């Protein structure tokens, strides 16, 4: 089937909250403009991530029914999805079309940003896997909402209440996948399968950050709450 009137409303509404994020070029312009030291990149990363968590909270609050969830559950979902949302947004930005030779330079600059070699590999492997899916803006917006309303999260007391909120977004995403790519009845499951690779960034995020090739690792207090560093 096609999107119902209620599903088009939900999609446009998720699209509008999603678009409140910092524009991709505002990020890639800076990285492409000039090379920075690992210390300068660490501060660009922390300020980008503080802004991102801030916007992600506002995005999450707008998710239909999120406000009706238990307060402890609301916190558990935010804390359980922030790192994954950041890397999915980083993958969205990375795979955006740029002039000839720019993506190569952007990739070289990230590679030499100060991040440990141990982490460059699974990071770029994930970004390229996302790239092969040729996701639309709507697919990234719905995937981000689905990542956030994950009932299979740690410390969630009422899973069914979270399941009820995720299921309608999973349905809109499925219908969208079927339309945009009739050529791949696997599209929906590939998109859902990438979400499993995304979770792996949770376990090693703290070590990825602490191994940044800088002398001091300062984070903002909002990032200490979310990332559990410092």
């Amino acid at each position: 089937m096609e999107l119902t009137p209620d599903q088009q409303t939900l999609l446009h509404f998720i699209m509008d909250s999603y678009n409140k994020q910092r524009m991709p070029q505002e990020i890639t312009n800076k990285i492409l403009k000039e090379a920075f030291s690992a210390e300068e990149n660490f501060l660009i990363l922390t300020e980008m991530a503080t802004n991102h968590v801030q916007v992600l909270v506002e995005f999450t609050k707008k998710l239909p029914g999120f406000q009706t969830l238990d307060h402890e559950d609301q916190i558990a979902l935010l804390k359980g999805s922030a790192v994954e949302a950041m890397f999915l947004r980083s993958a969205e930005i990375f795979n955006k079309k740029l002039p000839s030779g720019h993506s190569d330079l952007l990739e070289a600059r990230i590679r030499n940003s100060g991040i440990s070699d141990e982490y460059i590999t699974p990071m770029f492997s994930f970004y390229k896997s996302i790239g092969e899916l040729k996701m639309t803006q709507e697919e990234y917006a719905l995937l981000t909402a689905i990542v956030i309303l994950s009932p299979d999260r740690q410390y969630i007391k009422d899973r069914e209440a979270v399941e009820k909120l995720q299921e309608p977004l999973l349905d809109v995403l499925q219908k969208l996948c079927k339309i945009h790519q009739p050529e791949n009845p696997q599209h929906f499951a590939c998109l859902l399968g990438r979400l499993t690779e995304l979770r792996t960034f949770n376990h090693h995020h703290a070590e990825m950050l602490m191994s940044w090739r800088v002398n001091d690792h300062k984070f903002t207090p909002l990032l200490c709450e979310i990332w559990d560093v410092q």
């Binding site: 801030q54 916190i75 804390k79 709450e225």
Partner: peptide
């Protein structure tokens, strides 16, 4: 108290 900045942003 553990996630006070996060609880503050969720309420506001």
């Amino acid at each position: 108290k553990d996630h006070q900045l996060l609880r503050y942003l969720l309420d506001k």
